[PDB]
Amino acid sequence: QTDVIVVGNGVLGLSVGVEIARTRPDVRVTLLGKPARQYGATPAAGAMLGAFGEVTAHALASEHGRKKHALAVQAQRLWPEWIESLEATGTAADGRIKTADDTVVLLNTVGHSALDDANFAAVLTALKEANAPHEEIAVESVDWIDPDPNSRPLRALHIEGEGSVDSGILLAALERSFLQAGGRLHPVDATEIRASHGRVEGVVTDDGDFLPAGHVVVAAGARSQRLVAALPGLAHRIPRIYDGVGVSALVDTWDGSGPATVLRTSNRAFACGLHLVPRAGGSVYIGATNAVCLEPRGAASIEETVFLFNCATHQLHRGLNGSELRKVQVGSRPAPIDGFPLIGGTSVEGLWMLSGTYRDGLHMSPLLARHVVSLMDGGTGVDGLREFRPERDLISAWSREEILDDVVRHTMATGYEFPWRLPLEWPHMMETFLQGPFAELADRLSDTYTPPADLMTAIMFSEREQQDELIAYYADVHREWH
Amino acid sequence: QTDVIVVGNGVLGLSVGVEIARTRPDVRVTLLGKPARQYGATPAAGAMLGAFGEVTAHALASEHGRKKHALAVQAQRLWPEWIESLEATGTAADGRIKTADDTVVLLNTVGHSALDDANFAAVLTALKEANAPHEEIAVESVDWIDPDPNSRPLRALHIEGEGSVDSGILLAALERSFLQAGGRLHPVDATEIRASHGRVEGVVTDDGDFLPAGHVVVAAGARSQRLVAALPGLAHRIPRIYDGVGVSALVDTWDGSGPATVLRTSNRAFACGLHLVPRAGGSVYIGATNAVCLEPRGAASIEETVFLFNCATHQLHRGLNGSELRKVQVGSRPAPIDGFPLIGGTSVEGLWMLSGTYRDGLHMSPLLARHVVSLMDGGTGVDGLREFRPERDLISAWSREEILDDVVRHTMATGYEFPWRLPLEWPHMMETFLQGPFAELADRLSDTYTPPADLMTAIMFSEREQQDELIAYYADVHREWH
Amino acid sequence: QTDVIVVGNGVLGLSVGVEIARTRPDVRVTLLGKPARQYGATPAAGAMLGAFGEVTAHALASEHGRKKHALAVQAQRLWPEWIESLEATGTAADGRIKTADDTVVLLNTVGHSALDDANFAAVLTALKEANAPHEEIAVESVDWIDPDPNSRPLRALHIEGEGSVDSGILLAALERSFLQAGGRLHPVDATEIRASHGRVEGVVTDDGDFLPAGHVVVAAGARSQRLVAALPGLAHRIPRIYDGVGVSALVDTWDGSGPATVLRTSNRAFACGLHLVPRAGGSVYIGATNAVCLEPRGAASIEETVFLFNCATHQLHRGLNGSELRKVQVGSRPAPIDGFPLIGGTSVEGLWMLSGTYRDGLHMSPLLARHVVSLMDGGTGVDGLREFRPERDLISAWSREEILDDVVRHTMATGYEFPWRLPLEWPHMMETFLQGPFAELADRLSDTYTPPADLMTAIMFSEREQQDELIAYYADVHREWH
Amino acid sequence: VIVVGNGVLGLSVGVEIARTRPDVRVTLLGKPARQYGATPAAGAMLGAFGEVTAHALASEHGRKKHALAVQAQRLWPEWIESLEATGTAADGRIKTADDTVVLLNTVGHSALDDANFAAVLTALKEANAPHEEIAVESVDWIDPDPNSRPLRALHIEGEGSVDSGILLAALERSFLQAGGRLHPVDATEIRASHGRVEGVVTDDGDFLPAGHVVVAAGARSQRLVAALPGLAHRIPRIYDGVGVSALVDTWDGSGPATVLRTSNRAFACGLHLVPRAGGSVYIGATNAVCLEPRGAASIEETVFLFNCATHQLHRGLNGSELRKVQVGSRPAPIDGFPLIGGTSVEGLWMLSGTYRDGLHMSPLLARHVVSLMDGGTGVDGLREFRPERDLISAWSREEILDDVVRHTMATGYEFPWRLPLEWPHMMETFLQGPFAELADRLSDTYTPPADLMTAIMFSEREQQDELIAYYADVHREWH
Ligand SMILES: Cc1cc2nc3c(=O)[nH]c(=O)nc-3n(C[C@H](O)[C@H](O)[C@H](O)COP(=O)(O)OP(=O)(O)OC[C@H]3O[C@@H](n4cnc5c(N)ncnc54)[C@H](O)[C@@H]3O)c2cc1C
């Protein structure tokens, strides 16, 4: 066929669906996925259009991290016209995609100096280097916030033109825009990709049906690699994607108020972070925890809920303490095993992947969609995304030594972010006794590959059988590529 | 036949519905209320069959409190045959009403000595006085629990034959038993009770309909007095009932385990308390917060959720920290303004009330149902419930001095239960500076009536307009009865 | 006679002794006081030459506070030449008076935003207004410090030419310089000043002797008003001075290191503050608590010791935790009842006072000495000391409303500086319930006079008999002056 | 006879020798400063049943030590009578309390505090000692933080306390009355040849001749005897168990009628208040084994002691005046048991390594050594504790490794810390490996007790290497 099947109904599937439908009016594009959006990252997102706010010293210390940052800055420029084009297919009563134009980054001491102080400096540096509009402002001038004095910020940074969207209104606008462009929504899941003679034939659905296609775009979030890995040789040629389980909440504020801007800290222990995204109608979004899990999980832990609420009520606004909990949200950030996204073509003709975007696939969605659509039309898409081709040896963006320093520092940061109260000698003792066991795990996993810190901590506290399976995986990948 | 309308589909409405339908073949009985059970206490309950566990030194210091306790002990004896009679109308696949036969009461130091130490002694005394089977056990012998050592119990009390039911399975069994007995469920709300010539005519429903009846039983939980107060003179003759908003949660335990018994503390600050009720299928119930509100609220505050989770994870089982949150539940304990229930007949022929049961209407339900059904058949029901007739001057069960000591002590207990960490001189200072403002409020509200501590704290932190309205209410009640 | 007696052997007595001896070589100057220096402020001082570091928003909001600040800035200019003139009478082996040239002010969140944030801004403003050399610096550039990350500074201010002296080496240098200039040390205490026909005759000593003099300078620290108040009418014409009991400690650092600068916060709750003053030979000085006491006290409380050690180990250097405690020091800051010093002449010819200097008598010593010596020579001394003449109606430097806001804010600051951990609603409740009792005390004490916050808190927690005695004192002062 | 050392043990044996051998000259060495002195820093509790731990009573050597403590308690009333008899009313009273209350709170590890409270109750019942578990509400005087309050309390009848300062004064006075001579210098060297003591070189250069030398020099005792031939690897090393205590003038001049204490806690730390005359209370006491002596409190020790006392015993102590921070060295034997009795050198005796309870055992230990010196057999239970011995192995390496991880965790729970709930289990798992590795590296046969193992873990690599050599030289000497 010249038929296109998009597998997945998150921001990436729907965004690529809209761009394919709009630019290929002569082709049938069908998008698979259910309204439940099981383990769905996009519906649990605030979401911040995070570029400069997402800067960490650790990310900007690697070439791959600097490349990722450049793409985030490029994506930000597409959002105004993208939103215009999505709202155009609706009416006033569909509501507004954009919920804030600006972001304030707060620096408080409820965290590790080695992360929060380094990350605040790295954000300031990245803004100056980009000539991006921003101002360090007096904390007293930040409107709305009412923190616990012992948890209060002492520095604040206003980032102009870095805002937020309502992820629910965005998903609704994308579905409507997809239909307007001639797309068809088929609310079932793909169970199997069918291929022979090095080319896609189509997709078996979970209602037993077979849908034929010349093109299949896998944008199934954390399920994307598990779906393609069934095809011959692809188990050790497409980097694994795990579930970065994240917890967020919708809160009806005590007085119906909200901040005019996004409020956030820099990224914290293991890509956790504290932020408040404005919503319409006396609701605010607060987020968001992160924990890499080797198996999917669709419910918040008690610990995640308490940590998120404690951070927001102390560090942002004590008024949230008396505010009503409307919804606890859980979704899976697609967490690539080598720390970088899986975007583009495959050794199978007509098979494409758009996944592994972790914290910022929603922000990058208009750029990533346009890239894959350019590739499908025989173009070269966006310069700088070829490094992130899905069929690849695992990337080694950092030394084993760098990752081992990072994992101990992030482990300690879970304490300082609580925040704990310990005898003053205990942290130094814990630091010294964490180094050995993480060095031992890293050496045991593989002679060539080291999992990034966020994955290494999950592997450290997984079962021995799960660690053994990963040792086998890394060995089979080394065999395939070397 | 002579029609009966039961207004309300909680435990009390359904329990009286079942008893009327089963004992009165001459009556058509119709029960009003919606499946949503808005503000419903019963669905948010664990629930503990609380008699001896509910004992406090303060309750047993008043004649009215001792009378209430006696009824709780009598109700416990009805439960085995009551459950038998409800399960008999179903099949194995409907599930079991009883989830535990026994209770363990734990004493830890995450609370005020003036409440927890006095209440533990009062429970021991009440058990010995009743010749009830119990024993003080070694904490090491309490199975399953895994508390934070700094939050651990140092004393434990096993109460034999004081257990728990699944409130959801009880409600299902009551509805099924009601239908089997010839009852009719009409899923609408009463908006108005119609009366003329000193007699009930029936009920206007919220779909505009009028249902005629010779008998109307109001068991609408926290809405019960607001519904009858519209009838002539009844605004100052039926004590007000407020919303004792309570938060509980269902948790899927990390390993599917649960305790074999109820685990609880004694009642704590303002009729808050910590307990875990076993459930079938790897779930546990944890509860339960309490806050008297002058207006209803159907969502948990952030503060209530954090406090409940923090108490359960530290004081009962650290494993709950990594367990999955299934559901946050919110319901309104009917909180009578004078601290005692509203049970029996009215100055309006055929108008009955079953409400204001606060923490233990579910436990007392089989006894309370049988009492009201006996009264409706011209009997005298249960000895000792006449004091709790719904049409009455406000009861004064305590001196103003007693309530003022209680409210300061319970306020301080909110600190010790957190638990806070303060400079050692601060608690004595706070105690001294709380006395004056509560004495001033009590003196300003009325020359004769004092709200019980749980209501006094809610009034202290209500708006000036709400305090003024209550001053007018107490003055109009004094006028009516004196 | 033309003989001069200086009563008191602290920094002020010895400083004025040195200036009199050096400028009047034809006159006999005798200095009284014993080597033990009971309750002595000077030996317990670090000491910081505190001018800009002592700035608070509250002080600079009053005309009297702006006058005090101007004098501190004038005194700072005298110190380099004053030290040169004192070291000139000794040799290298006598040790160096100056222990640091510069001060770093740190801003952390272990305190009340309403004090620490306002005071940091006030220091920056006062430095710019004075054209003083200073720089806001990166916290990472502050050498030596190793705080708890949860207690770490996020802003830092370098003040050039605001340093510290070794108070012990200063006292030794002053005694040596006094003897070199012809001064005589008589190690007894004055019991009585003798005066008749409106002129001083001399001093009765505690060994029964009488020393004649034409001039008596009272610099007896917290005992100075008690000594002059015995003269006719002077009991209600010389403002009372109380004991500002302060605790400091000498610590031998784990590795013999110390910072190159003074390290301090701004002044905190009730003129407490955290600072570390470098010393020679592997010692550091840490201070300093403050409590106004209605009677003198010569030993640290447990609370004062714990608070000082906890602040220093968390906020400055965790290495101090493992460091050896050499000495806990206690001295009495002369605390004037109206909040301002007693400097200059009297209605008695030849009677002078130099006292009530509270936190900065040592810093102001060279200026205060020169002022009194100018007055004794028939000059007008230093411009801006006239409001601080010792024979005066009590100053009212603030409105009762200003002091009431200050005392509640400083009370709350004792919590945030601990730092406490409380439920988020508790601080607002405590703030509301503190206002009434302090307003009631202020209204009861006097219709015209209000004690400054530091004294008001001591009176609030004193016995009813001590409050009654103060009501009588204020009434007798009003009678004398109105 | 020369007694080397002027602590409770030296003076107690001095008094017993002087009183029972009136025909002999007994001279006692030591200076008024009592540098690193344990006795002056002691409360002191006459600790027998209060000193019981589950871990101590699980070993034969620990049960033997406990039996001696119970025997010593019976000697105290007549011993005090005999010391006060040499003075007047104005010298003050040695005894400050007759009874002890043991409090159980949750400011500690369940694995220590809960096990130790049960072990105390059991040891009291087994001994037929008078005691009763009492309502916490019936404990007079105490005013704890409610979050730090006890929920169980135990009254121990006839287990009390003495004023260590008044005891030392009474011992010196009683020594002089009995014909003893005080020579305020330190021994630098014991002189011996032909397998017999000749006497002592003092630090002022003098030589004092003697037929008997009793070494009771606290934590310095083994270092002094180790200089004699072969004795470096035949007398177990003694280290400094540095302890911090404080004298506090109470806000209202009040005090409790009894000793107030918890059971022993992390690494033989413990919280107690000992009554004193004149509106003073003693609070103690920290413990840290140090490989070199230390004569000043750390900031951490002072804060921990004050924080424990103000929260767990009486909030009134917060506003009370600090009179004195005291520091002394508990003689900490490397194998965990005392060094009492005779030597392979004729006329050389040792009384040391008593750690937490040398003062309590002093009248029994004095009488034992005096019996031995007179050709008797002294007290039946003391033979295992002879000073010239292979290092005792009272516990398995596995037992000590469980203990050291549990005591490390207890330092957290006693603070008390506030941590994420997953952190303690993680720390427990990551402590096991490094302590197992240290124990295996130190020796194939000897394991230091937990209190010493933690000090070795955090010592310099050179100090660990020196201990590996010491253990190897001891193994060589005895096997
Ligand atoms: C708590 C949280 C907060 C976040 N905050 C932000 C933020 O502030 N800014 C930001 O830019 N991003 C944010 N993100 C999202 C992040 O950018 C993600 O990388 C992004 O949403 C990924 O989108 P996706 O379309 O790849 O995956 P998803 O959004 O997970 O979409 C995948 C969809 O495919 C479906 N699917 C799965 N298997 C199949 C199958 N076999 N067949 C068909 N359908 C299938 C799933 O059910 C799901 O609906 C957040 C995410 C989380 C969890």
Ligand SMILES: Cc1cc2nc3c(=O)[nH]c(=O)nc-3n(C[C@H](O)[C@H](O)[C@H](O)COP(=O)(O)OP(=O)(O)OC[C@H]3O[C@@H](n4cnc5c(N)ncnc54)[C@H](O)[C@@H]3O)c2cc1C
């Ligand atoms: C968190 C929590 C924990 C609890 N734990 C326990 C426990 O362990 N043990 C125990 O014994 N009890 C427990 N209780 C419950 C307590 O006993 C209550 O007193 C009891 O459930 C009250 O029963 P009810 O039927 O009067 O009220 P509800 O259960 O509130 O029932 C009233 C019903 O009437 C409906 N209604 C309201 N207005 C109208 C109208 N106009 N027309 C028709 N229907 C209307 C409501 O929607 C509701 O469904 C708990 C309650 C809470 C909130």
